[PDB]
Symmetry: D2
Subunit: 387 residues, 4 copies
Amino acid sequence: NYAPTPVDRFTFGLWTVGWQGRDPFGDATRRALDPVESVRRLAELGAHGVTFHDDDLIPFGSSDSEREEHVKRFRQALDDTGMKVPMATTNLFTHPVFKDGGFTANDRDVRRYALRKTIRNIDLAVELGAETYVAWGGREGAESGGAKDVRDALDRMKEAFDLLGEYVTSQGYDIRFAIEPKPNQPRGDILLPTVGHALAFIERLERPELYGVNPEVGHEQMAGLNFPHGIAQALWAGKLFHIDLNGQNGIKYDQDLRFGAGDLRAAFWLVDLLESAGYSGPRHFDFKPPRTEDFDGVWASAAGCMRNYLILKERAAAFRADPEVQEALRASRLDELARPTAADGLQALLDDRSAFEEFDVDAAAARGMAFERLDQLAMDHLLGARG
Amino acid sequence: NYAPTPVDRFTFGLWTVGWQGRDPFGDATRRALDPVESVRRLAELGAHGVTFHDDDLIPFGSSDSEREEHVKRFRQALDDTGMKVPMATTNLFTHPVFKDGGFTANDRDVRRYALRKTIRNIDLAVELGAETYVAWGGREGAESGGAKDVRDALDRMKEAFDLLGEYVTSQGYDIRFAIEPKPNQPRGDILLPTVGHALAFIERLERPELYGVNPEVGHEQMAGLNFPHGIAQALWAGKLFHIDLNGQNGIKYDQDLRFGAGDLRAAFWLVDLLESAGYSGPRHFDFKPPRTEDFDGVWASAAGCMRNYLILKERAAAFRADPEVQEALRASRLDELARPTAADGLQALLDDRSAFEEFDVDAAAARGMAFERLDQLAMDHLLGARG
Amino acid sequence: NYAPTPVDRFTFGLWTVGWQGRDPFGDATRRALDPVESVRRLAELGAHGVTFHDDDLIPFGSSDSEREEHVKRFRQALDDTGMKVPMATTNLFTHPVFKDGGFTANDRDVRRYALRKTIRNIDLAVELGAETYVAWGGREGAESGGAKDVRDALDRMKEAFDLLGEYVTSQGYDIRFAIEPKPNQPRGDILLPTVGHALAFIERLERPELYGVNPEVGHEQMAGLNFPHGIAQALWAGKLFHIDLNGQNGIKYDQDLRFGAGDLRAAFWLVDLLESAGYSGPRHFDFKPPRTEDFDGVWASAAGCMRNYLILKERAAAFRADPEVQEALRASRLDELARPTAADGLQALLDDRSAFEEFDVDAAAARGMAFERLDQLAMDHLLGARG
Amino acid sequence: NYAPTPVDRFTFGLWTVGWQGRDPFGDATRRALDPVESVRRLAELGAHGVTFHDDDLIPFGSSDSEREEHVKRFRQALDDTGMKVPMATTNLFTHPVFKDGGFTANDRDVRRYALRKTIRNIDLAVELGAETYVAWGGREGAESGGAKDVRDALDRMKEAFDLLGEYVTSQGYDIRFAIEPKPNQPRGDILLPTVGHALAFIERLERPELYGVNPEVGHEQMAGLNFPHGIAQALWAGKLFHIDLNGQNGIKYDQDLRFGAGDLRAAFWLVDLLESAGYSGPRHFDFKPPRTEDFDGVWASAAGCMRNYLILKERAAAFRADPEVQEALRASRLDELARPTAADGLQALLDDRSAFEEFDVDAAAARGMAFERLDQLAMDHLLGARG
Ligand SMILES: [Mg+2]
Ligand SMILES: [Mg+2]
Ligand SMILES: [Mg+2]
Ligand SMILES: [Mg+2]
Ligand SMILES: [Mn+2]
Ligand SMILES: [Mn+2]
Ligand SMILES: [Mn+2]
Ligand SMILES: [Mn+2]
Ligand SMILES: [Mn+2]
Ligand SMILES: [Mn+2]
Ligand SMILES: [Mn+2]
Ligand SMILES: [Mn+2]
Ligand code: NA
Ligand code: NA
Ligand code: NA
Ligand code: NA
Ligand code: NA
Ligand code: NA
Ligand code: NA
Ligand code: NA
């Protein structure tokens, strides 16, 4: 049951199942995986594709002949399996040179190098067929107030993304960018900490149509926010270019639990929203099998990401299709929420005594919203307990 | 020492010093204050002005003769004291009719009434001289996932603010709007939960130049965010039309402590940023004297809001003026952060071997940022401990 | 399906379904309920019993004849329905006299009054058959550091609970006390903020056997803690005398959502633990139907508390009974965790080369824990998706 | 000014200034330090002593001759500088064998090895003069509910600490243990997550007098708790055997900022409490110079830990010594809080009409607490702004 197919567009970062288990307090618990073995194992589970940072595919500092051989082996694995590469990204956070940032490092020489490292990998991404190029600026930010002038850093962050936009336009590439917010970790505070801040920043870029967001479930939950609500705002803005799926238990260090773990009802409402809205992009998992696990547990945890998406898809579809839920949605006036407040226009609203002098505020206030019965129908559908 | 003057543009909501102390668990501990007495007492402390919700000034449901008399008494108090009214707002949260929202209530009749209540008070705000009209949509949101379709709610929230924009344009008013984000409370999740989400939403309004943000210190801290960073993004966007100053101890219910309480170093870095950026708007306090206090404690807590701003202003100015701090800012390359990454342009950056093949990443990585000595100079200046 | 019976020992506070909907920002949305109507409606849903604060049953300041009549009507309702009253408590938080606390108010006269108000209601609790007397010290704490010397407050808090212990011993009552922790709200920080702090405090009382804890799901989650883990420590200590069940979405104001809402997998693991441990006390709901609801939504939300407990009970029992889960528990060495580390004793452990010189740390480190497959079996059982 | 002396008992872990900067996302930014160089540099700053995990001093897997030489060099450095070693601890978290715990690993063989590794280092600690042996069980806990039966884990955790108690009694050692709580990280939830849970657990050990707590500022703040309040409960219980000082910005990953950073007013109230209570133990820093820093920034950050303690000590002493603050403490009835509620005894309290029938609750409720003026005197003293 719930068996994924490439049809389902489930994708995984090489760094997810390949995470060796090093954490702030502990050494690696698993050996490194060859990307070829991750591609073949993920295909065997029913994944559609993988994604990569440059330095997951090509060891940092590789010669041009080494780079060619790493890419060649990876492409043979993709060809052998039918796996795709819909997204790629740059590692601008692991090497010590990026300790104060890539695009917003205080040192100008580092900002220029970060751009050249990104541009080299955009070319590779396009060669592998990627539609989206993610940027998670995990080193952009500060531990102390004097270290980082945030208006100057936003100027540098806009300059960088504008230059990347100029680059892909000049090359005629169709790729687009997706900025991934995170509120903190590894910096004490990270710039563009939420979906909202990233959406607002994009509006000030010179070619705003080339940029969207890549929200991650656990990152918005590290600020205690409602992830389905933030995805709804991204969809409303036409900017949900990609998404990272995982689980998180509230306001903690980024746990990257498998999808469906962490906040299970937020996972249900997220899948309901993605499917209702017809989101067509990859269902990408940015997760880490816990370092307690051996490789059988790695593949079990990856299989669980896809299984939980598919169970939640079934239950959310059954909820929306149930004539009792449709009745309850009408009882709670979800249909009215979708109607214009005043398609009659401002002067008609001003002249309408039923909106002011003749509005019976106490009779309106007496109407219950019936939200609790609606939510218990939703709980019963999620748990398969209708009856 | 630190004695406020109206010059300092310190303002207070009528609902702040007038808060009677009712909380989720407890009855009022203070009697209601007449707005005239709050205006006279605040002037005696050195405040510049007050602000109001409609229903703080005019009891809900007042007749037109009652409304005139309440306004007349209030204007006499303003005239008697020289106090100004730079900002006003609508109460779209206390009356039970607004339990599922004003502008985004599921019931259309409530959304139309919320607009008419707002428009009536915009006219009053303009008559009293206000430059800014705030909107804190504290009832816009949900406790459960099925209750509120957030894309439909954002459509209604845009329709409402567009109609308000049309209204003030049609009347030739110069007032502008400031949206106040909050992440939760009293709804389980509130729409536009952070400065970023509000800035992004404003970009999609039909007349975006008429709207900015009114960020509140404690609200961004209820999501664990860095308030000075969010104010920097609002300033970068040209949208800091007003601000609410108070204190908060992290991720809790909205405490509205006096300014300087809560996160004291974030208060220091906020004042440093406002003064360095030349913010010219009111320094408005949205705070609550704790319900443990009698009226002498109310006025002590209000005086403390202004005193702590002025102490922090002195210390931040001394920090920025100290030639040792200016040296440390250069040692940490804050001057380079303010320089363009690539004013030579994209082709020059691509052709520059010093940005890639000849960049010595290990020598760059070895350079310390000297951020800790800079931050200890900042701590010494805040505490008046230089030496 | 899932239909509660009094057999299930589900109980509700009068203040839960009776909450009129006043919140920090809004007036009441429902009229007050007569306790007699709440008793009859809850019985109709299949509840076992109710609980009360003194001032939920007897309006504050009632004459002795008024008190008798309120109690008489309530007892007739209990007799008419078979409902029980297993728990009662004191309101030491709503009246303004308790603004700095009851037992730990700085004013000694208030501390003495708080004790006399408690003792009067202990007598009533015993007359109504209650086995447990809860104390939630929601006003014990502070908004500022100088206001409350916490060592002196703990001395006063111990003196108070010791005097209550002396009182019930002297009267030959069998009732016991259950202290309810909460980390904050309505005070900026509350004393005894978690289950751990309350358990530790109890150990220093003069008659420690008379006191346990009354943990509440949402309160421990307001500190981001694992509620099932805290209940496990309370059970380990023999101190889980009562429990408050509800839902909460992380680090926020106390939301008191219906049980099963909020963190659904924590609700599953809580029910698994209570049932496995054979907890025999009431399954008490301390929740609030959201103020969006009319009275039909109040009773729907109360019915949902019991329904979600029963669904989770079924799924947790099926998980524990499944021979595949029992196999996975052995694969993850849960059986070894329950065995003594060194029943052979310290000298045997010191002399055992297999514990040190001959322990193969790399072979041990290579063993995976298989926790992810175990957790996905748990997810499949919760969602009714086995297959 | 504020120059530390060994008199001040400031101590540092070898792992603090020696932290090489590896974090969940980034490689080391500094080379490893020889413990001899850390001892000499810390002495040059005015530190009193250092502390160590076994594997900070002796590389894991060292031969007995290697172990002797590492210890010999370290002792020469201590002798050359007058530095002391008041505390030591075991690393039961870095090596992969401890991925599910040391004392509460599900695998029994790992639990026995963890005890033997601890006992070997207790002997070394005693040889170096340590008075306290800390245990931070950072791997004790779980990411999923089925993985760890917490009652069984607490049985194993008690068995382990009982065996350690038996060991030091049998050897006639005077050392005592201090358990360090942390709520999460690196496990999804850690057992004994707060000071309260650790204090409660200690009460159930067979020799409770041998164990106290080692609270860390940032760990309690990762649960949003008030660290000075938790230290007050530990002092009240007679269990503050050691303390870890650092800074933290709220509910995040463990940041280990230098002391005084993070929540500055909580640092003030902590120092006020330690000094007022006469705490006589080490003022130990468990902190990390940010990985942005080179070694000059490491020593600047360590110097700042001690400087901020000494500035806060001066300001807290001035606050307590100020006759205006003493007056305000009396105005807020802190003197009454320290008096018994009912030294006249229970029967006298029951018979006292001034505690019930004749208590004027409205006159009591009208009395303000004057806490805001007291707190602004505290703010003025912290900032050196009196006047
Ligand atoms: Mg629609
Ligand atoms: Mg500049
Ligand atoms: Mg057992
Ligand atoms: Mg004393
Ligand atoms: Mn993540
Ligand atoms: Mn991601
Ligand atoms: Mn607020
Ligand atoms: Mn505000
Ligand atoms: Mn509660
Ligand atoms: Mn409760
Ligand atoms: Mn730490
Ligand atoms: Mn520590
Ligand atoms: Na700039
Ligand atoms: Na979209
Ligand atoms: Na719509
Ligand atoms: Na601006
Ligand atoms: Na005392
Ligand atoms: Na128990
Ligand atoms: Na056991
Ligand atoms: Na102590």
